[PDB]
Every structure is written in structure tokens, then in C-alpha cells.
Automatic annotation (TrEMBL), chain A:
Belongs to the universal ribosomal protein uS2 family. It comes from the Eukaryota. Required for mitoribosome formation and stability, and mitochondrial translation. The chain holds residues 55 to 274 of 289 of the full protein. It is found in: Mitochondrion. This is Small ribosomal subunit protein uS2m. Keywords: Metal-binding, Mitochondrion, Ribonucleoprotein, Ribosomal protein. The keyword Repressor does not apply. Its main location: mitochondrion. GO terms for cellular component: mitochondrial inner membrane; mitochondrial small ribosomal subunit.
Automatic annotation (TrEMBL), chain B:
This is Small ribosomal subunit protein bS18m. One of its GO terms (biological process) is translation. It is found in: Mitochondrion. GO terms for cellular component: mitochondrial inner membrane; mitochondrial small ribosomal subunit. Zn(2+) binds at residues 20, 23, 55. Keywords: 2Fe-2S, Iron, Iron-sulfur, Metal-binding, Mitochondrion, Ribonucleoprotein, Ribosomal protein, Transit peptide, Zinc. The chain holds residues 47 to 143 of 143 of the full protein.
UniProtKB/TrEMBL annotation, chain C:
Coiled coil: none annotated. It is found in: Mitochondrion. The lineage of its organism: Eukaryota, Metazoa, Chordata, Craniata, Vertebrata. Belongs to the universal ribosomal protein uS5 family. This is Small ribosomal subunit protein uS5m. It comes from Sus scrofa (Pig).
TrEMBL record, chain E:
GO terms for biological process: mitochondrial translation. The keyword Cytoplasm does not apply. This is 28S ribosomal protein S28, mitochondrial. GO terms for cellular component: mitochondrial small ribosomal subunit. The gene is MRPS28. Keywords: Ribonucleoprotein, Ribosomal protein. It comes from the Eukaryota.
Length: 220, 97, 86, 135, 99, 130
RNA sequence: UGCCAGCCACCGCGGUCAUACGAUUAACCCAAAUUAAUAGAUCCACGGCGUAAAGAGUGUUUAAGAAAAAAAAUCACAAU
């Protein structure tokens, strides 16, 4: 038991424990059309600090702050996977649902790209089973549903005290998202880049957890 | 210290505003040929903005000129003059289908 | 908690009150940090910080709420509406 | 059990104060991660109130001195013969070549707009691009 | 280290400027019976109709030429706080990578 | 309820052995067809509803099918679509869509290579397929 | 007893169906005092005026009040 707390305390003492800086850069985000957002009329009021400007009606997201938020979001996602946490990729968008399902299957985490039932996260002991374990992290690839309204899961995670890492567009509300990352969720290159980043972060976290366990076995 | 920052300047891509057909023109009460183009040949009604397509001043000026000419004895009220009936069509209303 | 039977309503209220819990910052565990003047929908509440020897001279419901919270000394006045829920 | 209140504050605060009071006797695994790497903004609920009156958003439009030459190029020649390729990161367009010629002509000590325009238009013929003026 | 403003100033979209009557190159990524989803690459994907001439030559991955009309179709209506995004773009078909 | 079904299996086996012994047939050759006749003869319940008659089948046949244990001892669910409500239906839909995409890519490659070797097998009128 | 007798500061109670009427027991609070009535102290708004009471049918002006940081006066169209 004494050696178990050391494993959990090891990554908390280092800033870049999993070396996630090499995964992306400003140019990598720029090449994926991340900086591009909706028109000025679709701009949310809370998205003003997360915007670089407006290019003839279309607002532009500042990739400097995009990457600044993305570093923390990826570090938080990697730590949850390292600490054996349940990660649920929730996204309601009928274009990349198969890609999200495949990325989650490859990660070994859980996914939800279909219609979200009402009492799913709240009335869990009746919707999922007698006794279930709530997801320890919720990842949003598309904050808005098909009705252009905030998703149920972003509110339910805040209600049930579940951290949420979410890609927020210019028309999204980052108020309830624990780790919002301003970007574009409608570009296929951007969504593929985000899926690959969240895939490699989880893969590295699990591989490093396995290596740390192997070292712990040799410790005694 | 960055020289690539945007500058708060005027929009260079500002398109010119659309002009009415009589923009920067002189409307008169004596040009019955001009006044007849905005009236119905069969009834004599004065076409509205959605039919003519004139910006705010010229529609009212044409209406006033038509009303003045119909009473001064220059243009018939009940019908359009067959002499000016063969004028080019400026209105956007189609009757015969 | 609302139910056809009184016992069922009591049980539902007891079971559903735990899910909604606030944390109250209590100065020295006896009073509040500063005087609070709040205006709800139609109820105005004016609460003033009180010393050790002035214990719960408030409305009969605010006194019970503060006793359950842990506040031992407080003065409060309610003006306007007297609706219990508000 | 916990606190299902949304508008009161943030999840970190609502999880920390519960343990501080002693209701939540089990510390969540994500609380340590939040303490180690807090986000830039605390996840507190903010109501999107509508903006009325003379108040306007603080977002500023994106414009450069290059746009003042691009508008002139598009007014006369319009879209260039070479179609734009958005896939290529380092793609240079016909108007990009025109503005690159224009800045060098400005550096050459020419202040007249006609001199800066017609000279670039004729110099593009040296490279060999076709300009289609719109009448 | 290149800056975001520096790369945005040299971005092809910035050079394009207004999206009215601009010739662009797009690549088709999805195929329907009569509709073609062409990704011109700016933000969204436009939808066009297969022409009568050389209709069979339009396949998945084919590169075509477009005359872009609007980058994103949004409009305001009665009682609408924000715009109604169409999640698409307006463009027309002219040719298929004439080279 | 796994141990209940496990005990019911043993009870069914011993009851089948005793039924074969009391009926006089070989327990090795004793089958469900003989079980039905033995039950009908020993307990002649005359009722119009056949489900109301006495029945002795395997526990997996009598008791309804049970949903598998969705999560391990650590609490982590097994299937990646557990939080979707209908994990089996959604996995079937996902597999169908993945196979559709694979078929589309393969057919696109075949069309690019100018190879048409597939046939139309959708018409199953003579077979009577629904 | 049974909308009868009757009781009450407000709500209200009286059905061969009364913990509210009359009687008994029991119980509670005061106390050489206990109730009823009349007087008092206190209690209305430093609050509102679209739908509950409230923006007076309109403009100008006397008295009176604030000028607390700076700006402005005037143009198509049916005032009279
Ligand atoms: Mg979006
Ligand atoms: Mg009495
Ligand atoms: Mg009686
Ligand atoms: Mg009484
Ligand atoms: Mg009595
Ligand atoms: Mg006395
Ligand atoms: Mg009052
Ligand atoms: Mg009134
Ligand atoms: Mg009035
Ligand atoms: Mg009156
Ligand atoms: Zn005009």
C-alpha cells in the first residue's frame, strides 16, 4: 500500500510527464483549419476572449490560446487515463460518428455518439444497472447537438461533478466545460487531428502506466 | 513587436450601394412618358416599392409628380396613354401568364 | 418532495435533499463573515453579523436553517414576501 | 452523496467544500489532477445575458495594408486566372504576386498610385501571367 | 517560432479575401445518387449536382473547379437571437481539374 | 442468480435420472421428447393453455435469458458502447456502417482500377427471403 | 341537543355523526387574582405608479429646484 501512493504521486510532481508538447504546434493546428470559426452573427457572447478577430464576417480563433488550452486539456486527459479513469467521448454530430466510435475502440475508452437519453448520467442506477461506475472524464468533440442547443451531458457532468474537456466552437458555451479548447469542430481535418491527439495521449498514458507497474514489480 | 498584426483601417472591399433607377436624376410632372412607366396600363394604379425598386426619395417624388400631372391635365387617371404604352418595361410585375 | 401520501412525501424530500447541498462559509463557526442584504424574487432578507452573545434572533425558519447549518449567532430580518420556498 | 447544484459555482469548489465539511469522505481521482494543473478559467456557471443599448462586442475586424491592394486588384482584374488552392499551405496566388510586386514598387520610392499599379500590371507580363481586365 | 498572426497573414484564405465569385479547387469526398459533396477546403463542404456532361467521370476523390458564392450560409429571422447556419457552403460547378 | 441456475441444472439432471428410473427407459437414451410424454402421463393436467401445463425443461430454457455482466470487478464496463443504453444494437449498427464504408472504399478502388467482378445478389424472390 | 338550544378576537362549529354547544372527568396557563369591554404605547410610504391604487389629454410659464465631466442647435415625405 505504501508503494501504491508513490505511483499516483509520481506524475503529479512533473509538468510535462507524458511529453505531450511534441504532439502538436501552432502550425499543426493551422494546417487543420482549427483557427476558422462561424460567422459573426453566430458568435456566442462568451467566445469574445477566445477570438483573434473577424475576417469579413467570419471570426478567427486565436491559435495561441487554442494551444495554451489544448496543452492543459491533453495533460488532464492523460492523467485521468494514467490513474485508471473511465473516459467517455460524447459527441452528437452525424458526420464523424463512425470515426469517434473507432477512435474510442482503439483507445479502449467508451463512446456515446447516438441520441442521449434523459436520465442517463443522473438516473444511472436505473438506466445502466443496479450499481455502476460513472465516467471519470467526459470529452466533447461537438458541444452542440443537431438542434443547435447545449448538450445534455455537459450539464449532467457539472451536476454530477464529472470533469469535462470540450472542443468549443464560436457558437458554443464554455461556461460549464472544465477544460474548454477554442477550435473548429466542423472541419474533417480538425476533427481528425483532435481524434488522433486524444488517441495518442491515451495510448501513451496506458503504456507508461504499464511500464510503471512493471518497474513497481521489480521494486520488490 | 509583431508587424503582422491587423490594423484598424476601413474596409477596402466595401461594395458601392445600389442605386435606384432614377438615382441622381430629375423627376418632372410634365414627362407623361416617364410617369406612365410606373402605372398599370389597364387600371392606372401607381406601383409600389416592391414593384418599382426605387430608393426612398424617388418613389415619393414620382408619386407626387403623378398626382400633380393627373390633376393639371397632362396624364389620364383611368388608363395609361396608348402612345406611351409601347415604352420599355421597368416594373417587375407580370399579369399575363 | 410531493407525493400522494404524507409518509411518501417525507421520504422523497429526505432522499432528494441530500443531492442538493450547499456549503456555508461561517466566520469562527458562529457567525457570517459580513452583513448580507439580498433581494430575491419578492422577498428581501437583511442579515447582520452578531457577536458571541447574540444567538439566533432571526425568523422561526431561518433560526432552524442556521441551527442545522451550524450557525449559532445571527440576526436576520425578512421584509416583503413571506413565502417559505422563496 | 454530493451536490447537484449548477449555478452556485464550479465543480472543483463543490467537491472541495464537501470534503472540507466532511460529507464526501472519498476524494475523487480527478481532484488531485485539477489541483496539480488548474485550468485557465474556473468552470463557474455564467448566464449568457443579452447585450442591449450602445454596448458592442470587443472583437475587432482583421484587416491589413495588403487588403487595400487586393481590393484594387479585384476591382479591375477580379479573380485571377490561376484558381486558388486552399490545400497547399504555401500557395501563392495571382493577387499575392501582384501585392508582392506592389510592396517592392513602393520600396522603390514610387508614391503615385497609378505608378504603383500599372507598373506592377506590366511587370506581371515579364513573369508571364495573363491578366483579364473586367470592363 | 512562427506566430499565429504571421501565418494567418500569409494564409491562402486571407489572400482570397471576399468569397464572392472566386475560382477555387475542391475535392469530392462523398458521393450520393445525384448530389456531390465537394470540399473546397475553406471551412465547410458544398453540395452540387452532377452535370449531364461527363457525369460518370465524377468519382470519390475527384478534383473539380468551383466558383465560390458564399463561405457559409447564415441568415437572421423573426425572433431569432442568432443566425441560422446551414452547415454548408454555396458554390457552383464549372469543370473537373482542367489541366 | 448464476448460482441459482447452476443448482437448478443439477436438480434438473437428478430429476431426469429419477424420471427415467421410474418410467423404465434408459437414462442415456432419455431425451426431451420422452420427458414431455412422461410429464404428460404422470401429471395429466387438462388445460386449454399449453403453457399452463406442467413442464420440466433445462434451466436455460425455462428461465429467461440473462444480460451478461456488463462490467468487471474494477467497475470498468467491457463493451465500449455501454454508456449508450443499447450496447448490442449500437455495436451492430456500428459494425454494419463500418462494413458499408469498407465496401464503398473497395468498390471505389475497383472502379478506379476498372474492375467489375461483383454481381447483384439482392433479388432473392425464388428463395423467399424476408 | 341535533343548523334547535347555542359558541367565537379571525377562520368558523352545530347531520341519533360535536376534542368548537351545555354537563362530568382529565389536562394546560396564570394566580389573590382570572376573564370581558373601552382606552392607550407601537403599528402606513426613504415603498410603488404596464396588467392589482397610482404617469394626471397636451404644451408654455410664476414660485421653486438640480445645472455636479464634455458634447448639440436646422432639413426629402401627410404640422397648421
Ligand atoms: Mg461549429
Ligand atoms: Mg364557550
Ligand atoms: Mg353526540
Ligand atoms: Mg376554541
Ligand atoms: Mg365545550
Ligand atoms: Mg391584582
Ligand atoms: Mg403599501
Ligand atoms: Mg390601474
Ligand atoms: Mg400621458
Ligand atoms: Mg381623465
Ligand atoms: Zn435613388
Amino acid at each position: 500500500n505504501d508503494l501504491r501512493d508513490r505511483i499516483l504521486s509520481e506524475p503529479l510532481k512533473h509538468a510535462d510527464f507524458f511529453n505531450l508538447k511534441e504532439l502538436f504546434s501552432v502550425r499543426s493546428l493551422f494546417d487543420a483549419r482549427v483557427h476558422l470559426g462561424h460567422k459573426a452573427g453566430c458568435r456566442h457572447r462568451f467566445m469574445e476572449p477566445y477570438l483573434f478577430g473577424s475576417r469579413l464576417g467570419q471570426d478567427i480563433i486565436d491559435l495561441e490560446q487554442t494551444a495554451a488550452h489544448l496543452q492543459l486539456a491533453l495533460n488532464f486527459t492523460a492523467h485521468v487515463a494514467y490513474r485508471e479513469g473511465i473516459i467517455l467521448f460524447v459527441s452528437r454530430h452525424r458526420q464523424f460518428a463512425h470515426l469517434i466510435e473507432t477512435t474510442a475502440r482503439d483507445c479502449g475508452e467508451y463512446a456515446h455518439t447516438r441520441y442521449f437519453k434523459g436520465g442517463l448520467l443522473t438516473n444511472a442506477p436505473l438506466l445502466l444497472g443496479p450499481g455502476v461506475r460513472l465516467p471519470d472524464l467526459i470529452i466533447f468533440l461537438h458541444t452542440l447537438n443537431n438542434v443547435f442547443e447545449p448538450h445534455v451531458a455537459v450539464r449532467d457532468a457539472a451536476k454530477m461533478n464529472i470533469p469535462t474537456v470540450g472542443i468549443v466552437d464560436t457558437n458554443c458555451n464554455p461556461a460549464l466545460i472544465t477544460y474548454p479548447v477554442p477550435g473548429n469542430d466542423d472541419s474533417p481535418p480538425a476533427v481528425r487531428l483532435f481524434c488522433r491527439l486524444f488517441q495518442v495521449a491515451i495510448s501513451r498514458a496506458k503504456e507508461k502506466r504499464r511500464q510503471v507497474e512493471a518497474l513497481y514489480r521489480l521494486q520488490g | 513587436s509583431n508587424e503582422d498584426l491587423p490594423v484598424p483601417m476601413e474596409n477596402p472591399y466595401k461594395e458601392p450601394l445600389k442605386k435606384c433607377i432614377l438615382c441622381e436624376k430629375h423627376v418632372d410632372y410634365k414627362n407623361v412618358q416617364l410617369l406612365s412607366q410606373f402605372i398599370s396600363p389597364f387600371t392606372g394604379c401607381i406601383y409600389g416599392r416592391h414593384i418599382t425598386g426605387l430608393c426612398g426619395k424617388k418613389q415619393k417624388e414620382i408619386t407626387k409628380a403623378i398626382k400633380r400631372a393627373q390633376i393639371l391635365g397632362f396624364m389620364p387617371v383611368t388608363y395609361k396613354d396608348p402612345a406611351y404604352l409601347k415604352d420599355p418595361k421597368v416594373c417587375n410585375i407580370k399579369y399575363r401568364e | 418532495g410531493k407525493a400522494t401520501e404524507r409518509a411518501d412525501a417525507f421520504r422523497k424530500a429526505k432522499n432528494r435533499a441530500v443531492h442538493y447541498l450547499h456549503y456555508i462559509e461561517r466566520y469562527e463557526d458562529h457567525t457570517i463573515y459580513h452583513d448580507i442584504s439580498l433581494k430575491f424574487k419578492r422577498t428581501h432578507i437583511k442579515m447582520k453579523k452578531q457577536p458571541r452573545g447574540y444567538g439566533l434572533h432571526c425568523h422561526r425558519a431561518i433560526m432552524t436553517i442556521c441551527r442545522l447549518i451550524g450557525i449559532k449567532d445571527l440576526y436576520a430580518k425578512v421584509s416583503g414576501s413571506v413565502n417559505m420556498l422563496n | 452523496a454530493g451536490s447537484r447544484l449548477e449555478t452556485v459555482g464550479s465543480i472543483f469548489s463543490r467537491t472541495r467544500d464537501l470534503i472540507r465539511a466532511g460529507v464526501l469522505k472519498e476524494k475523487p481521482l480527478w481532484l488531485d489532477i485539477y489541483n496539480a494543473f488548474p485550468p485557465l478559467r474556473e468552470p463557474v456557471f455564467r448566464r449568457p445575458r443579452l447585450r442591449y443599448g450602445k454596448a458592442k462586442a470587443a472583437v475587432q475586424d482583421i484587416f491589413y495594408h495588403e487588403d487595400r491592394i487586393r481590393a484594387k486588384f479585384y476591382s479591375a482584374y477580379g479573380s485571377g486566372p490561376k484558381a486558388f488552392d486552399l490545400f497547399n499551405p504555401n500557395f501563392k496566388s495571382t493577387c499575392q504576386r501582384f501585392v508582392e510586386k506592389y510592396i517592392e514598387l513602393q520600396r522603390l520610392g514610387e508614391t503615385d498610385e497609378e505608378k504603383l499599379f500599372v507598373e506592377a500590371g506590366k511587370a506581371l507580363l515579364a513573369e508571364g501571367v495573363t491578366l483579364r481586365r473586367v470592363g | 517560432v512562427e506566430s499565429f498572426a504571421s501565418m494567418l497573414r500569409h494564409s491562402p484564405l486571407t489572400q482570397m479575401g471576399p468569397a464572392k465569385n472566386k475560382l477555387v479547387i475542391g475535392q469530392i469526398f462523398h458521393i450520393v445518387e445525384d448530389d456531390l459533396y465537394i470540399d473546397f477546403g475553406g471551412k465547410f463542404h458544398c453540395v452540387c449536382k452532377r452535370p449531364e456532361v461527363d457525369g460518370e467521370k465524377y468519382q470519390k476523390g475527384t478534383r473539380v473547379r468551383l466558383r465560390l458564392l458564399d463561405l457559409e450560409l447564415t441568415s437572421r429571422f423573426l425572433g431569432a437571437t442568432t443566425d441560422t447556419t446551414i452547415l454548408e457552403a454555396d458554390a457552383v460547378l464549372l469543370g473537373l481539374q482542367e489541366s | 442468480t448464476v448460482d441459482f441456475i447452476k443448482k437448478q441444472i443439477e436438480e434438473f439432471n437428478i430429476g431426469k435420472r429419477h424420471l427415467a428410473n421410474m418410467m423404465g427407459e434408459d437414462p442415456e437414451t432419455f431425451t426431451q421428447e420422452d420427458i414431455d410424454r412422461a410429464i404428460a402421463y404422470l401429471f395429466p393436467s387438462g388445460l386449454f393453455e399449453k403453457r399452463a401445463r406442467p413442464i420440466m425443461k433445462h434451466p436455460e430454457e425455462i428461465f429467461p435469458k440473462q444480460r451478461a455482466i456488463q462490467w468487471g470487478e474494477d467497475g470498468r464496463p467491457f463493451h465500449f458502447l455501454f454508456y449508450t443504453g443499447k450496447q448490442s444494437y449500437y455495436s451492430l449498427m456500428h459494425d454494419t456502417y463500418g462494413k458499408l464504408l469498407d465496401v464503398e472504399k473497395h468498390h471505389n478502388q475497383l472502379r478506379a482500377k476498372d474492375l467489375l467482378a461483383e454481381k447483384t445478389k439482392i433479388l432473392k424472390d425464388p428463395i423467399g427471403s424476408r
